[model samples]
Target: MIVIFVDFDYFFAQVEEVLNPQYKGKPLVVSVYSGTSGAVATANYEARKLGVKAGMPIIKAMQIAPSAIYVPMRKPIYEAFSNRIMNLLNKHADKIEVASIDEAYLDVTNKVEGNFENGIELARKIKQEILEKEKITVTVGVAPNKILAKIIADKSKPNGLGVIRPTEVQDFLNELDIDEIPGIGSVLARRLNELGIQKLRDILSKNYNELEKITGKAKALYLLKLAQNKYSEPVENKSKIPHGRYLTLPYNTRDVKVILPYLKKAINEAYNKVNGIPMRITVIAIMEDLDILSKGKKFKHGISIDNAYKVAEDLLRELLVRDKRRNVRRIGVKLDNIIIN
Candidate 1:
């Protein structure tokens, strides 16, 4: 069966641009900091051209592209869009694994019937559907096996499509650098380089048993199989159910003045989404010095919005009164023992 992997390119940054029409053509950076001391979470291609990349310190990113537009990380917004994309992909394939929020592995044998042209067309259609609905572009790779498909997708990234046929897999992989193979990072790449195994062909010619002596039996055997265009195994996709919601506050202000309103809002959102009243509530406080305090309460049936809020508040108060740190960095509220009717 042919497996296809589709990945969104710079997903968060692209989504920001899609929502904010004004930022369409400009360079943008998504960061955890929003300040000089923060870290860059993601960067658009425009920002890449300016030498800004993911994991670069925000201060250094500013040095690279002083005018780059920076946006703070928003998990809720990203999760909402991720759900939409998953729904679209589920319609196309019978077995689909959501590898991550931004990537998916799809078994497209039934849809494409092992036809490369039809597979390519299916990829294009997936891309077009996402673009039309979400205004986001995805890169897809198709191959007889998952590894080749993933590697080819990575090779043809940023809104591109690539396919590696069974016949061309060996030659195609030969042209790639040793590091291009998944699981061969800098360390292994350097070791292989020292042993004069600079390419896939060199590695293959050394015999699997000898290579096993150098790079472990399992890894060596796996690499040999990959070089021969063999896939490991397949897994089925299963449905996932979310339990409840949690909110981490920026500060530990236990005063009802600050906590009550946020508690109400969080509880309302959680209740609406789950459509059930939770049987237990837990509040956790994380102080500036990295200390944690947690408290919880069990409730009988017939829970109300007011009861939930009060429970959350009591838990927060119990934790905050004992903590010595005046400056709290984070506070979290979680609903547990939920009955999903």
Candidate 2:
């Protein structure tokens, strides 16, 4: 069971640099929304060094690093990069699970032929290829299971590679504190610390029954297995089921005639992108104030673009009325349950 976890380093900020080379090497933060209420989606390492961080409000980040260039998040551009990277990762895996836009788990046991050195070499090749092709660095963690691989990736961030052989999993996990374990957050760590379980190995000192009494049966079992290097969750290749496309309107408007053209275009583009007929159509509207409203209709069978567009138009009209402001800043159409046959 060999799983390799890949994570993009400061994804949004890095992509921003790629898009505009002038922003390179400067402290930059990609923010969501436009003003003081906006929050940072990501900050490049340079920005992070100056006390800027993801999830910090734009106003607070400006106070922390006044010189930092703040920009709004662009989902489409980021999604394009993610797709390219996921495609690269897919070629190297026997099975791959996309964990998020910036992370994935690749099961490569057979690809490596059960050899640890081969796994390391494969990781290096992947890292090199991604840097050369995508123009961004990725950190990869190779381990015996998904959790350990992710933890290893977390430790080796901002363009790093890590590997732990099956035999070394115990010793590697042993040297870490209980809080350093992937699933054990601050609250759980505090609880564990109160019980004199500061180090991961300390948990192993107590029997399952004793640990269960402290952390409950389910959680105790998980912690115990992790402590013993026995928590091995296989990576299931997750299906990419929903195909969605969204567009920010040229202008916020209450007019259905103006909105329908973009909605139609989005649904048309969505249909082109999907391999199968769409069985469900969903329309989403972002209000001028940023409140998102959506409505969906499911068909008994797969429907054509013409059929889907009609439903989508109705959904949009409903949302426009549903939106108290009667104003939309952006429009989106999603096609779900695509039937290939």
Candidate 3:
């Protein structure tokens, strides 16, 4: 089976450009800060050329590219655009799995014919439709499996297309670093490196038991399959994981009077969506002009609207006292670990 993964390039920055045409052709950074503060939520290619990068502190970004344009994030607008992008993909694929706001996996094997050529055409068409319809560009990768597709997409990024046939998967991955494998991040990479597993070939050469001895049974088996480009998980539109909602406020305001209402509204929205009382509620409050804060409560097996509200309120009050600032910019509330039954 063939799968295609489409990843929007610098999604938030591109969305900002779509909203304001003047941002085009310039180094642009999108985040909570329009100034030399906050974290870089996203950076356009132009900004990246100057060494500006996502997750870098805003101040550091400004130091690197002093003249880079900065735009604050607008989630509502981005979400609307994302819906449109997803709808467009639905037209060409039998199954679509939204990996994030800007990335999706599509099961296109049944839709494409003529092998590689068909995959190339589908990628081009998807890119064109998105650009023409939403004024945004996407990078697409086509492969026989999801892991390979994602890696190829990363290789062919920022308005690019890549295809890796089943026969070419092994040779294609030969020169690639072990870290390039999906789910192999800094910690795993370091661990693998410590074990002298620095290359895909090295990983591929290890027996399943040898790998299991190094990284535990399940993880070792998973890495072995990933190294061999073997994946059997089908594209699933809906995940088995419970839905979650997170809201971040601008300041750390201690006024429970002010915070409670927002928490109530967030809870109500989650409650309505799940149609069941949230089993757990967490309130994250940050101090004034500070990003650091504390989390409170991990309720289990309770779904009452009143219980949820009270837990949220109580947590907020406790956080407010710990916060040394009188004025706060951000307030966040999350409903997680939800269960219908």
Which residue pairs clash within candidate 3? 249-330, 249-331, 250-329, 250-330, 251-328, 251-329, 251-330, 252-328, 252-329, 253-328
Residue-level lDDT tens digits of model 2 in 1-341 = 88889999999899999999999999989999853478889999899999988778888889999989988889899989998998888899888877678988888889999887788889899999999999998999999998889888888898989788888888888887877777556787898899899887887787778777767877777778887777888876652457878888889898888888999998888888876777788998878888778999888677888788789888887776665655788898888765542
Better of 2 and 3 by TM-score: 2
| Residues 1-341 of candidate 3: C-alpha lDDT, one tens digit per residue | 77889999989898888888998989999867654458998989999999988789988888898899987788788878987897788788877777778888888877886376687688888888899988898999998877788888888888888788878888887777777767766787888888888877687776778777667877777776666666558886531224444454544456667777767876776667663445566666555655656565654555587887877777777776665545655555666544432
Model 1 reaches what TM-score against the true structure? 0.68
Local distance difference test values of all predictions, in order? 0.75, 0.84, 0.75
Candidate 2: clashing pairs of residues = none
- The parts of candidate 3 lying over 4 Å away from their true place are 33-37, 113-117, 187-196, 206-219, 239-268, 271-341
> lDDT tens digits, residues 201-290, model 1?
677788667787778877787677776666546734632233344455546554656755665676677677753566677665566665
Q: Ranking by lDDT, best first?
A: 2, 1, 3
Better of 1 and 2 by lDDT: 2
What is the lDDT, from 0 to 100, of the residue 275 in candidate 1?
39
Candidate 2 lands at a TM-score of: 0.72
Best by TM-score: 2
